[PDB]
Amino acid sequence: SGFRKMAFPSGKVEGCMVQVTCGTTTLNGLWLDDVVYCPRHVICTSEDMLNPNYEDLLIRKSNHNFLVQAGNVQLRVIGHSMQNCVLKLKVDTANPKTPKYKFVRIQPGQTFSVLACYNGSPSGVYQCAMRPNFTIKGSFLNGSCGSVGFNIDYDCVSFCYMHHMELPTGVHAGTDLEGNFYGPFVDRQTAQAAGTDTTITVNVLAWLYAAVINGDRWFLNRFTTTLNDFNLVAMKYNYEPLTQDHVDILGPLSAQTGIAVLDMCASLKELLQNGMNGRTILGSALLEDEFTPFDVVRQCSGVT
Amino acid sequence: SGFRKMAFPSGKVEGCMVQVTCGTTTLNGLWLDDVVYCPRHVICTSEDMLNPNYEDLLIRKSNHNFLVQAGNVQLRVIGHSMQNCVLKLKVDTANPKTPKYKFVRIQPGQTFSVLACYNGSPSGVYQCAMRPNFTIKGSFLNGSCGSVGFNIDYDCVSFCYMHHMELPTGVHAGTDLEGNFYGPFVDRQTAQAAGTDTTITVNVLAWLYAAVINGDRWFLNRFTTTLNDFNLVAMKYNYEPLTQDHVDILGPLSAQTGIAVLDMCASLKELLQNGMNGRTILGSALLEDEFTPFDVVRQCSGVT
Ligand SMILES: CC(=O)N[C@@H](Cc1ccc(O)cc1)C(=O)NCC#CBr
Ligand SMILES: CC(=O)N[C@@H](Cc1ccc(O)cc1)C(=O)NCC#CBr
């Protein structure tokens, strides 16, 4: 029993982290096969960041200007290219620790683990979600750029995020491993405001199922609702609309607990309208929305 | 910016996890050098668990009855001994992935990372604290026994916990790596109730400092207090007494923020007496107590 914000074991990703230096800027790289992936803003002076022309800045850079260090051993850079907002540094050595991997672009609501790194060295691991506004609420200091987000399916690491920047509101923006930003964000130190950080309704419901499985049942009530009635209340509370697809995805947790998804919706409706009244659910005083239905089943079934 | 419940990178510990089977029971082992450490209850039938005599049960066990598997490779057991509540299985092969390590016995309030494992395979990593009642609030299913808790200082893993059992209240009990239980718990399926789970005051204050550093300042007030006045309020709210030693330990965060520890105590006093009024601090609706002053400085300074 018990339910924790749980990250994937980070070992497979620790084995891929390197240091990238361009001029005075040091940040992190991901070394997979003979390619090191890093934020293209590694080439920017702090001046450049206000209005960078990456193609023009890149003309002034040669292979030998990209200093790549794996542990305390230097890698030889034999090629470099820009793909969207990432640089791909071709090195002469395949990472011997390259795991089986994929690059995936996740949807808002999806969760992943972050291995926070500084100078190519792992600092810590924590669990995040892609917010509905395409920000993530990370823990990232200056030097953490190039830190990556991932999921593991058995022995295959799906890389979904690379850390690029912090907005003036202290929320985080980054790319997939093809260098495309999540959301409308750009790698420029300009005014960029995030939109509404809505609550991931399907994730809250998953977590309420987690709570029932783990013996936390006080919030279960005598009511049901409909998708349309629930959604009226969800919109009022800046919750994402619930779709039949979400209902279908909760099907396993519905079956395991014997609680109809629309009955759990009616419980969530009352929690929104009435609050927690100083009570807690799985040790939280607010409704947690960074566990997916897949996460709750994984953690409640002990997948490795 | 940002502040997350962050675990140590688990790679160094993933490299030590093995499967231990005795008869029909499979659980996890920790392989360091040529010794595999596991809960002695691996030798128990579900019947045995009600009133086990471990010395008597162990007489019926030989080296060849302890099946140890590292990945999908079998280790040869050449010796076994009981130390307190752990078994030490001597194997013929030194773990080639043995990190630099120590066994430490932590105090209540201290935090550590858990690598939850099933069948010797890492499932996930999360952060815990030794509660004042010597329980931990983990996420552990049946098969998770032998999963370990640890801290890393640079390249040295300090192992502090091995998971042994879940109490009927779904809280967790375990040993240090010398096999001594934290608190009064025993490896028998008998009535064992935990005492008062008090709040780790110094940890709450550390986290309030974390909040100020990360721009969350609404709870800072115009008041101060004294240790004795604060402690009167702490006791009333089942908070641990604050000592001068705690004040001294917060000194770094006091200095970094310019907020006197007793001023932050007066802020915490008002939060206890008045509640959050539906507000949040670092995304929490309750006062977080599983970050140590050391954790807050580490995460706010980016130690690797
Ligand atoms: C608001 C601010 O200082 N952002 C800086 C520095 C910084 C980066 C990551 C982080 O997690 C915290 C701070 C930034 O975004 N630099 C990278 C770029 C580009 Br183009
Ligand atoms: C209440 C209950 O079923 N406890 C069992 C099974 C169990 C173990 C760990 C866990 O995390 C969840 C469940 C138990 O404590 N077995 C180990 C011993 C001894 Br001696």
Ligand 2 centroid from CA B142, angstroms: 6
Separation between Cα atoms, residue A44 and residue A49, nearest integer Å:
6
SS3 of B168, please?
A: coil
SS3 of B176, please?
A: coil
Q: Which CATH architecture has domain A15-99?
A: Beta Barrel (2.40)
Best residue of A4, A151, A274, A303 to probe chain B, by most B CBs closer than 10 Å: A4
CB B198 within 8 A of CB B134: no
User: In angstroms, what is the resolution?
Assistant: 1.6
CB B117 within 8 A of CB B149: no
Tell me which chain B residue has its CA closest to the CA of residue A123: B304
- Same fold flag, A1-14+100-197 and A15-99: yes
* Ligand with the closest atom to the CA of A118: 1
Which residues lie below 8 Å from residue B236, measured CB to CB, with a gap of 6+?
Answer: B272
Q: Which of A22, A38, A145, A160 is catalytic?
A: A145
Ligand 2 centroid from CA B189, angstroms: 8
Contact residues on chain A for B117, CB-CB shorter than 8 A: 304
A1-14+100-197: CATH topology: Thrombin, subunit H (2.40.10)
Interface contact B9-A125, CB threshold 8 A: yes
CA dihedral sign, ordered B197, A274, A291, A200: negative
Q: Which among B1, B14, B119 has the least Cβ separation from residue A11?
A: B14
Separation between Cα atoms, residue B281 and residue B264, nearest integer Å:
14
CB A37 within 8 A of CB A101: no
Ligand 2 centroid from CA B299, angstroms: 33
What method was applied to determine this entry? X-ray
Q: Which of B16, B22, B38, B41 is catalytic?
A: B41
SS3 of B143, please?
A: coil
Per-residue H/E/C for chain A: CCCCCCECCCHHHHCCEEEEEECCEEEEEEEECCEEEEEHHHHCCCCHHHCCCHHHHHHCCCHHHCEEEECCEEECEEEEEEECCEEEEEECCCCCCCCEEEECCCCCCCEEEEEEEECCEEEEEEEEECCCCCCECCCCCCCCCCCEEEEEECCEEEEEEEEEEECCCCCEEEECCCCCECCCCCCCCCCCCCCCCCECHHHHHHHHHHHHHCCCCCCCCCCCCCHHHHHHHHHHCCECCCCHHHHHHCHHHHHHHCCCHHHHHHHHHHHHHHCCCCCCECCECCCCCCCCHHHHHHHHHCCC
Tell me which chain B residue has its CA closest to the CA of residue A12: B11
Q: Which residues pair with B121 in a beta bridge?
A: B118
Interface contact B2-A123, CB threshold 8 A: no
Torsion angle defined by CA atoms of residues A206, A207, A213 and A218, in that order, rounded to the nearest 10 degrees: -120
CB B109 within 8 A of CB B132: yes
Angle at B295 (CA atoms; ends A9, B2), nearest 5 degrees: 80
Tell me which chain B residue has its CA closest to the CA of residue A296: B139
CB A304 within 8 A of CB B123: yes
Ligand 1 centroid from CA B289, angstroms: 29
Contact residues on chain A for B1, CB-CB shorter than 8 A: 140-141, 166, 170
Residues with CB under 6 Å of ligand 2 are: B 41, 49, 140-142, 144-145, 164-166, 168, 187-189
Q: Which CATH architecture has domain A198-301?
A: Orthogonal Bundle (1.10)
A85 is catalytic: no
Ramachandran bin of B240, using left for φ above 0, alpha for ψ from -120 to 50, beta for the remaining angles: beta
B265 is catalytic: no
Q: Tokens representing B249?
A: 């330990």
CB B3 within 8 A of CB B85: no
* Ligand with the closest atom to the CA of A50: 1
CB B161 within 8 A of CB B102: no
Residue of A103, A97, A34 whose CA lies nearest to A68: A34
Nearest C-alpha to atom 15 of ligand 2 is from which residue? B165
- Where do the domains of chain A lie? 1-14+100-197, 15-99, 198-301
CA atoms within 13 A on the CB side of B264: 27
Nearest C-alpha to atom 6 of ligand 1 is from which residue? A142
